[model samples]
Target: GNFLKLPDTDCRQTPPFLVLLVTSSHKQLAERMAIRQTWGKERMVKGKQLKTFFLLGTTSSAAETKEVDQESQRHGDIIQKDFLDVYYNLTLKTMMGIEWVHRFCPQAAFVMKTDSDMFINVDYLTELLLKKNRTTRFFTGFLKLNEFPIRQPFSKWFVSKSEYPWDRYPPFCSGTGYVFSGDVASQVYNVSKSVPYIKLEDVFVGLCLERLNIRLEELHSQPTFFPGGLRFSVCLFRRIVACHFIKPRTLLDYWQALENSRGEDCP
Candidate 1:
């Protein structure tokens, strides 16, 4: 499927070194605003160009879609397709992300996918990309291995055997945040069409990677996080590449706290 709304990729010099594929939803302008005020605002860092685009599905409401269009017109960073904006339909959004890269910014060295409810220390992640120098077929994030699908209905992540017969899942990165080389985007999406649609977005991504004979890259030194606010602190936020389950205002608070505490020692 083609993008209904496309972000500008005007390349005056060169393409972005790391493109951000952030999934967002409708009628949530303030979260996008909060992101624009901080880490997502910085496009260039340490000689590398970073590009960030928010991916979303079509909204049911006319006025809300109009609002999203207005925001996109102002920011020029929103990517939208025809699928409905929803949790179950998230695999489509991720596919839109991979397809957008395949069609638009294939020159980007790497790409990262996450949600609006996450906070990324973009500079810190870019430094790691810089340190890694160059890569192909690389994918990394906080990884999961030897995991099984939920059997009962009590949990939100429940999966029926009809949906997935397997008790154990293949190794996959958390969708809270994950990074991959740009070429992999094309590879995955090409193979993605062969796989049927699934409700678990990240798991579906892993399935595609598996079909492509790609392995999940494990981060040993530092990792992205998925804990809720129970674990947030200036130091913790400063050290990680990404953290999920974030609030809009909490993003600002962490941004400011990290700013004020710079150069100070931490425990």
Candidate 2:
């Protein structure tokens, strides 16, 4: 797989306080572009610098690869690796994004990892991050606590005892969306080298943070950053950070409605 090598000459000018590293599959170009056209377009939010990049791996479909190349050329916001893009290798995909931040965008104050299907309220989150103004070793999201590995062999998320002997997972933010101080990227990356590989990306992240002794702070009173899919409601969406399982067309519609519904009394 080709390693990350961003345009170093442009690094000075591209430093942002928040870098959104959105994990995407090879065929979700429409979803990726829709996100860019919506909240991802905000280069500046809440008086803080912000940038978005999509992370992907190669597909067997040559047409898809060509389209990905074209999209990358036009938007200049994609980081693709040559590994096989599949569900089982999501850990690899997630690591690729983290490595990109460590190597190319080290100056970023925070990095958010989310899925392409998520509805991220970047404006609200950006203001929240700016106000908190946390520095090194910060990580937060809709957090999970004391989760146990599924032992069922037929289950999609099953973990064999050989893979993970522990009954309880260290606290982990849901992989749906999570944010950490940029300085933590290299720390996690370096530590992850020694950790045993696991297919579950979020659990692996929890392990790395546990090794580093960094706490996973929960967002108190915030319900919108969802692990389960959210029911569509403009009023409900106004004040939250993110929701999952949105499709490309749904994203467009929801964004339009959210924009039009803003400032109207929810009552």
Candidate 3:
């Protein structure tokens, strides 16, 4: 999927050190807006600030299309392509972010490919994980080690034999959230051209990294980023990097809870 067109992303002008390229869809407006107000807000780390850009694909309705166009110009943080955004096209949706960084904002030092309905402790991510580490070839998140392809045709994650002729997938970080160095973005996107496409976005990414002879990092922390919602607690939110499956309303509620719990003791 070629980048049919894009906005004046402004990344090259004043590139951010950490780029949050979130994968979003047409009706996730509330989720997008809530994140903008919450963890997705730009932050400065070690004198360099981070930026967030929402990645989307083509919309069916022209009205919503123009609506997003206005939103893009207003926020200056949308990167969309001309391809249809089917459920399986998530592979296409996510890679668009990588391609954007590679083609335009190559100066960016790091990139986190995450989703809309997630709670990301950006402070913990940049200051804690990336603070003292260069790890230029770094890639880390919730690692799914030695995952076998789903063979059940009725299964949502069914991978056909032709699409993936393999017994096991190279370790893949959960698509819910994953972080990688900027240079890795360039490397992964370039190799993506040769690797055949698959609907499983993160698995496809693992294939690309495997081709490059790169390996995914196994986190030392018990649970950093995850795919399902966590039981609510201020301390939990403060401690973990991200939690997925949060709805728009609950996502904001969680963020607000965290904000109000500042300096307050937990358990």
Candidate 4:
């Protein structure tokens, strides 16, 4: 629903982006990434090289927050359980990213957020990021607000009417895949600090960006990628960059697909 507006940044102050790969302390994650480095192809798009910084989101290293409704919280509570976990981890992600920038990549320009499950078409992402470099503060994996509903208590990821009365969500990209400029990440992180935490991490980020007057870019090119049907999602590691509900069995299939798709290039 929103469009990108270019910022007037001076070349001297342009920051370099540090791509932080967010992952939990799951053993499969490490093994998968290792395989990717071995068989996966990492490339630079336009002028930006897709760099990977492994972020281990552990019980100890990640941000900590209290639960709102403990009696109702469960692993699959859907709406309640570790909702704060999402924000804690997501904020930690941004803050840690800033730490990296201030200490290691001061001039970094963008941050690519992807999970350990799917495949990221670096070439495609790079082209889009650079081409839309002028604006598009936040780029998301999938956008599904056309007829989405407000948070209802019974819904697995439910919420009470008092929590959100609106019938629909503000345009938001799914959390599965997204990218944002370094400036916006910090801005959003600061906003998140004061805003009442929302269980839906992606929506929370979208709302934060909206409050800070940020824009979003909806990527429709690679829709339907989250389907669990493909085994390579968590496997081929490097070739597949992002996915939801990814299984360990699909690793080799992912690598094979990535290998089969080799070519001069594409975006």
Candidate 5:
């Protein structure tokens, strides 16, 4: 997918070392708003600051178009490309995000790509990043080691043998969300141009990282970023850096719980 447009994201003067890029649909305005009001609102934390941006593509509906524009004008955080927003094109979207980071915000020290349906404890993530030593090859999330592509034709994750002949995919992080050092963004994007394109965005990223010899640093101190199938508890939610498959309503409720927990323990 060719990128026809890019956001004029203003972070040149007060550049944030950490950039959070959320892969969102054009129609998911409510989820974006909820994130902005929740964990995404923290522009400054613990003497370090962060900049958040939403990576979106056009939708089919005109109402969605108008709504997305209005939200962008109000928030100044949306980076919309011209490609059609669909599941199979997620690899393109991920590449677009990497390109944006390389072109517009290369000064950023770290970059995180997550979905709109996930909840990110930005404070927790930021604190972790702050304490850790910086490295150009730092990349981590829920690391998936030695996973193989789905061969079944009926499954959503199916990949033809021709497209992916490997017996096991290189270690990759969950596409629901992943984090890497800022400099690695451009390196991976450049390497992707040579690799055969795969529909699975996370697997494709892993391939790029393998090509570049960058390793995924799994966070062992806290629980890993759950892609799916985790029971949500307020205390658990508060402790983790991110969780996937969140609804807009659930996000708002979880955010409220987090807010309430600031003053007292959630026991």
Candidate 6:
């Protein structure tokens, strides 16, 4: 669907913009944020410290899992990314993102939440923001309504629940890479706290919107920087506007390829 332009967003009382790089159990994910820090230093409208937080969940043989919570701080072991698994883990991790917004940066204008595997060109990101509704409510990575499946067990996001419980979900977008406006962040944070916690946070967040009657418009893959590829095409300038989900090894390959091309498009 095409993006419907709502009235221009009022910028008078907006909070300061802060891009919160969120990842759990993936140290390399945090590293990606650090790398992009320098890559797009010039594109920052305001140089906000790229904040980092890790939730270390640990299980040990010294004691059973039941009583671990009390003895957790004492244990040296920390659970890795595989600990929570993608389902519930993503949900809880998302909460931490909200927690950061609420506790430390309540004054933030917007929060850019993304995964570590994806490479985001901040220059492209800033330009995209410049084209936003100004009062940017909620921005998301991917949008697929008609293509959404009703049920599937093999897929990571298999749907067992009823389809379109209310005819359609509020303008919720994908979990890959999305931006949340400051005004809505607090509301979302509060809503998350009140709603029954679901294993899938993105869907859970979407449910919150459905329940609240708030809506999010799809950005036509505009704000969401998802590009389907493992390597960066140095020759493809348009690809710069998309996110590259690649391995560290592949990133170096793409970087070198770009170097060889002297800055040109990749196929």
For candidate 2, give the lDDT.
Answer: 0.83
TM-score of 6: 0.64
Tens digit per residue, CA lDDT, model 5, 1-267: 355455555557767777888887776778888888887774777777777888888888999888888877777777778888898889988988998888788878889999889888877787777767855789989999989899999899999999898799998999988988899988997898997789999999998999999888876576668997368777787667889888889989988877776766666
* Local accuracy of candidate 6 as per-residue lDDT tens digits, 126-187: 55655676554564556544334335566765655552333333445556566666666677
Q: Estimate each model's TM-score.
A: 0.93, 0.92, 0.93, 0.62, 0.92, 0.64
Tens-digit lDDT track of model 2 for 9-45: 2445767888888888878878888998887885768
Clashes (backbone N, CA, C under 3 Å), per candidate, total 0, 0, 0, 19, 0, 9
lDDT of 4 by residue, 1-267 (tens): 011111122323534333544443323444344434532333445655445544333333222212212211321111111212243356454444434433444345767655555555565455655656444355555664553555555665665656655677776666666666666655765676666555566766667777887666555444433524344422243333345664434545555566776653543
**Worst lDDT 10-window in candidate 4:** 74-83
What is the lDDT of every predicted structure here?
0.82, 0.83, 0.83, 0.48, 0.82, 0.50
lDDT of 4: 0.48
Q: Give candidate 1's error at residue 95 in angstroms.
A: 0.4
Error of 5 at 138 (Å): 0.6
- For model 3, the superposed segments whose C-alpha errors exceed 4 Å read 1-9
Candidate 2: which pairs clash? none
Task: Look at candidate 6 and give me any clashing residue pairs.
Answer: 9-135, 16-109, 57-79, 171-216, 235-264, 235-265, 235-266, 236-265, 236-266
Residue-level lDDT of model 3, residues 1-267, one tens digit each, is 366456465776887888898888887788899989987888786677788888988878998788788788788788888888778999988889899988888788888999887889887777656554756777888988979999998899998899888899888899999988889989998899898688999998988988998878754446778786788888888778878889889888988888787888877
- Residue 130 lDDT (model 2): 69
lDDT of each residue in 1-267, candidate 1, tens digit only = 567899877533578888888887787778888888877884678888988888888878999988988888998988889999987888889999999888888888989998888888887787777777558898888788788999887777887888888878877888888999999999998898797556898889888888888888764465555534337787777667888778899889988888888999878
